[PDB]
RNA sequence: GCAGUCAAGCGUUCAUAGCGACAUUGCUUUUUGAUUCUUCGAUGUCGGCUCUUCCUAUCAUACCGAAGCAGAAUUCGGUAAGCGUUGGAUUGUUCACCCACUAAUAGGGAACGUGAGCUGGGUUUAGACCGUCGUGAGACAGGUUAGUUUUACCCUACUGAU
RNA sequence: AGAACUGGCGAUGCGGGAUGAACCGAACGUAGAGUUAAGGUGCCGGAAUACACGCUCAUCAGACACCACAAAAGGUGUUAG
């Protein structure tokens, strides 16, 4: 009851403050990232047909 | 083939030692007083086992 | 007595500076502390390191952006020690801690301005000879500072640009002493010598 | 208890001049030359002759004085190494697998590499310190000789060798392999 | 970025199961004209 | 995993989890094999382990020759229905999940394999290749 | 529950490689107990699911030491809690036992974490059945079955956003 | 949990023990000057970074009784005997 696509027990009692560490809803995407070790397989020439 | 003129040398650095009964730490054979602090510089030592 | 004071912090002890600073600045004197990477502190390096690693341990669990902001620069370690000595939570501590300006190395404005020394905090006088002491630059770097290799590249230019000034001044005043020593054999000076000048 | 004066003394055979200023020793000799820093110790030095030097500590109290004789030996070892020099003769030992040692010029300075340490494939290299010359015995071709002036370099390098040529995860009472020092002497006597 | 495609290439990873064999991989294409320079900026070190 | 594996495999789409009941090609009297486990198969909470082609499993017969059943025995899966991807690109699949009884050393019990067999199993388990008649 | 100190002896000989009686010193609050300060104009009370974090008295992984360590395999100990620590049958279960994989299948805390987060199998209203007790109404911490699980739009915290 | 003698809290503020019903000092009309208690004088914090003889350097130092803890056994670490 009251939803299933969520998390239960967002925290225990006496820390009494929801944590930076717990999963909570929000934005997804439009984040900055840097993947690495992407190999090049062709460097392209525009004047070539 | 170790030619025991040299086996004596290797044993000076490997098997002529004395060990604490309280921390199991290599100490010299002439010395008391395990140099490590966690044992409390104790005096309970023994020789290392070489025969059987 | 002077309106602004410039404290060279080399060979000084931290908590024995800060009890002088934190009172001289609460009583109305403006102070700047300069060359703070050359500070000194009691105790061995590993020991004073662990006394910082047991500070980094202390952060507000539910969100650590609320919690003890562990600053890694010497200028801010000293400021921490002073903020502790000051009631910074009032408009008196606040007003005092804006009379203070702490730096690493000696910038230009306080380059060409005289520096002083607090003798009741010098490690030399205070500490026993034979005790181990720890230097704040090595410490800050080991706990996550970054700008040690810069300060040394700038303060050296400061020093070679200052040594030439000193030599200039000395090779000027050696003749002032000669031309005022050549003028001290008259009545004007034989009479002053009786007054005590 | 805090004493009054504990002083040792350092003989000086000829050809040597020992310059001190602010606890920085500098020694010279036929063999070469050397320096040392002792800012971390409170100790004095006086010149009663060109033939000897007098080192002294004042109240101290049983901790400074143990470093007194230490310093005395360090300076004496230094003089000894810049008059005669030091020679450390290490030796190889093994049962089946020989140890194949050589010297190699890597991108930087010299190194000394060893292969077939118990059949291992890891070519384990060791830097040579700057103050060290290095060679192989010729009367028997299963030694090695480090040599130089500074014992704290020579011996440290020899230990650096025999610490990496040490077997792991095996019974050391049986696997008495590797290399080990055998003789410490000089290169004049 | 523009999009992705699928290719084929013979391998040179030696000793693998697919050495001297061909594979299929997916690639991204990124359109990349000439940039043009208009300026230069100078940064200097400080303790900040 | 390497309990009889000659070579080492690529990842194949994990088709049939435990609880699966796949046919048995070998001529050992069996007819189906109930997978109870997988060699390899690391742990994650609530994840049940799975078996790909070429994987070893540990299995339980439900139909065939009571001499065999009521005991676990190793097995080798040689056909699966989950479309999996080859490095040459194509996605292939079989019409039925099917396996083989085997010993822990990668050997077999039967003398043949009634049906086609996957290259991703046969290159790896060599005693399967000698008893297979068809490969893909 | 955990650990330590003497060390009579076991240990083919060999107190202490490992263990170790007779005694003796402590630590822990993840047991059970004692007590009854708070709460009876109510702090929602078993377990599981979910999820995060912490502790070390480390099951594994890393580097090391010691053995009655030849190798292989094992045990004892150390720094260390960074990283991981399962799928399933039976049971409401905590607990437990087995199958199986695995590097390993370590213990524990956070109001015996977590019910305006779930479930509601159990227990703890009312219906009802058996056994034993009782004259009887009725009892049972004995068994069985069925039995309403409410509200967030506030403040703070948290996640994101101007 | 339960008794004896006394003092207190209750019914009681005030300076001190950071904070605290009970502890130390001391008991209260409104105010001013002076002197002290207990506790303290590096800074927060008013007041000596005073004087003197020594001990200790701790990779979990130690630091205001009540009080908010710590042992048996050990150490050539050092000091004195
Ligand atoms: Zn020891």
Residue extents of the structural domains in chain D: 1-85, 86-189
Q: What is the CATH number of domain F15-136?
A: 2.40.150.20
D86-189 has CATH 3.20.20.140 classification: no
Name the strands in the sheet holding B45-47, side by side, starting at the edge strand that comes first in the sequence.
Answer: B26-27, B18-20, B45-47
Q: Measured between CA atoms, how close is A29 to chain E, in angstroms? A: 17
Name C80's Cβ contacts closer than 8 Å, sequence gap at least 6: C71
Q: Which residues of B touch D182 (CB under 8 A)?
A: 9
Closest by alpha carbon to F80, among F48, F36, F113, F117?
F117
The pairs formed by A17-23 with CB atoms below 8 angstroms and a separation of 24 or more are A17/C61, A17/C62, A17/C63, A18/C62, A19/C61, A19/C62, A19/C63, A20/C62, A20/C63, A20/C64
Instruction: For CA atoms D60, D66, D72, D75, give the dihedral sign.
Output: negative
| B9: phi then psi, degrees, rounded to nearest 5 | -70, -50
- Which tokens sit at C79? 């400021």
Give the single-character DSSP code of D45. Answer: E
What's the CA gap between F67 and C145, in Å, rounded? 73
Q: Does D86-189 match D1-85 at the fold level?
A: yes
What's the CA gap between E17 and D53, in Å, rounded? 76
Cβ neighbourhood burial of F7 (10 Å; 0-12, 13-18, 19+): exposed
E32 to A44: CB separation less than 8 angstroms, yes or no: yes
What's the CA gap between A23 and A18, in Å, rounded? 10
Q: What is the CATH number of domain D1-85?
A: 3.90.930.12
Q: Measured between CA atoms, how close is C63 to chain A, in angstroms? A: 5
Calculate the angstrom distance between C1' of G12 and CA of B52.
Answer: 12
Q: Measured between CA atoms, how close is F87 to chain E, in angstroms? A: 5
- Please tell me the distance between residue B13's alpha carbon and the centre of ligand 1 in angstroms: 19
- Which tokens sit at F131? 């008893």
> What residue spans define the domains of chain F?
15-136
Calculate the angstrom distance between C1' of G139 and CA of C36.
Answer: 85
Does an interface of 3+ CB pairs under 8 Å exist between D and B?
yes
| D92: phi then psi, degrees, rounded to nearest 5 | -90, 150
List, in sequence order, every residue forming a beta bridge with F75; answer none if it has no partner.
F57, F101
Closest by alpha carbon to C37, among C66, C78, C4?
C78
| A46 and E CB contact within 8 Å | yes
List, in sequence order, every residue forming a beta bridge with C30; answer none if it has no partner.
C4
Name the method of structure determination: cryo-EM
Helix axes C148-181, C136-143, angle to 10 degrees: 160
E47 to C105: CB separation less than 8 angstroms, yes or no: yes
Helix axes C14-24, C74-85, angle to 10 degrees: 60
Interface subset of C 45-74, CB within 8 angstroms of A: 61-64
| B26 and D CB contact within 8 Å | no
């Amino acid at each position: 009851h009251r939803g299933l696509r969520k998390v239960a027990c967002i925290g225990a009692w006496h820390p009494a403050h929801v944590m930076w560490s717990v999963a909570r809803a929000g934005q997804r995407g439009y984040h900055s990232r840097t993947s690495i070790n992407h190999k090049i397989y062709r460097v392209g020439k525009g004047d070539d047909e | 083939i170790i030619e025991p003129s040299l086996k004596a040398l290797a044993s000076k650095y490997n098997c002529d030692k004395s060990v604490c009964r309280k921390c199991y730490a290599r100490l010299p054979p002439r010395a008391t007083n395990c140099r490590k602090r966690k044992c409390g510089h104790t005096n309970q030592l023994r020789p290392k086992k070489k025969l059987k | 007595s002077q309106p602004v004071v410039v404290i060279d912090a080399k060979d000084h002890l931290l908590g024995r500076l800060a009890s002088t600073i934190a009172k001289q600045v609460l009583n109305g004197q403006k102070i700047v502390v300069v060359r703070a990477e050359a500070l000194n502190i009691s105790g061995e390096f590993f020991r004073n390191k662990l006394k910082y690693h047991d500070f980094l341990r202390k952060a507000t669990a539910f969100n650590k952006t609320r919690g003890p902001f562990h600053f890694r620069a010497p200028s801010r370690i000293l400021y921490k020690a002073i903020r502790g000595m000051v009631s910074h939570k009032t408009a008196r501590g606040k007003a005092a801690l804006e009379r203070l300006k702490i730096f690493e190395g000696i910038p230009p404005p306080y380059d060409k301005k005289k520096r002083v020394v607090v003798p009741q905090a010098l490690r030399v006088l205070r500490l026993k000879p034979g005790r181990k002491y720890t230097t704040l630059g090595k410490l800050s770097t080991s706990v996550g500072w970054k700008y040690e290799d810069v300060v040394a590249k700038l303060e050296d230019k400061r020093k070679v640009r200052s040594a030439e000034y000193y030599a200039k001044k000395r090779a000027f005043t050696k003749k002032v002493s000669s031309a005022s020593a050549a003028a001290s054999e008259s009545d004007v000076a034989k009479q002053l010598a009786s007054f005590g000048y | 208890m805090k004493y009054i004066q504990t002083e040792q003394q350092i003989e000086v055979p000829e050809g040597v001049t020992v310059s001190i200023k602010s606890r920085i020793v500098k020694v010279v000799g036929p063999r070469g030359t050397l320096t040392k820093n002792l800012k971390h110790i409170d100790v004095t030095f006086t010149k009663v002759n060109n033939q000897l030097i007098k080192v002294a500590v004042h109240n101290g109290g049983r901790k400074h004085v143990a470093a007194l004789r230490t310093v005395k030996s360090l300076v004496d070892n230094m003089i000894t190494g810049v008059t005669k020099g030091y020679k450390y003769k290490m030796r190889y030992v093994y049962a089946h697998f020989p140890i194949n040692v050589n010297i190699v010029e890597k991108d930087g300075a010299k190194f000394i590499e060893v292969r077939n340490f118990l059949g291992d494939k890891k070519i384990r290299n060791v830097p040579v310190r700057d103050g060290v010359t290095i060679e192989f015995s010729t009367n028997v071709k299963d030694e090695i000789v480090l040599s130089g002036n500074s014992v704290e370099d020579v011996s440290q390098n020899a230990a650096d060798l025999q610490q990496i040529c040490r077997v792991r995860n095996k019974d050391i009472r049986k696997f008495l392999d590797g290399i080990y020092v055998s003789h410490k002497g000089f290169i004049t006597e | 970025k523009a999009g992705m495609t699928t290719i084929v290439r013979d391998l040179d990873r030696p000793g693998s199961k697919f050495h001297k064999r061909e594979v299929v991989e997916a690639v991204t294409v990124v359109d990349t004209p000439p940039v043009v320079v208009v300026g230069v900026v100078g940064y200097v070190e400080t303790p900040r | 995993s390497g309990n009889g594996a000659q070579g080492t495999k690529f990842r194949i789409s994990l088709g049939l989890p435990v609880g699966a009941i796949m046919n048995c090609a070998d001529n050992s009297g069996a007819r189906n094999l109930y997978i109870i486990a997988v060699k390899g198969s690391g742990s994650r909470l609530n994840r049940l382990p799975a078996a790909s082609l070429g994987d070893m499993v540990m299995a339980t017969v439900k139909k065939g020759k009571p001499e065999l059943r009521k005991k676990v025995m190793p097995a080798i899966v040689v056909r699966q229905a989950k479309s999996w991807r080859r490095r040459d690109g194509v996605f292939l699949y079989f019409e039925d999940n099917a396996g083989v009884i085997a010993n822990p050393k990668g050997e077999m019990k039967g003398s043949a394999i009634t049906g086609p067999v996957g290259k991703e199993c046969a290159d790896l388990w060599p005693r399967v290749a000698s008893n297979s008649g068809v490969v893909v």
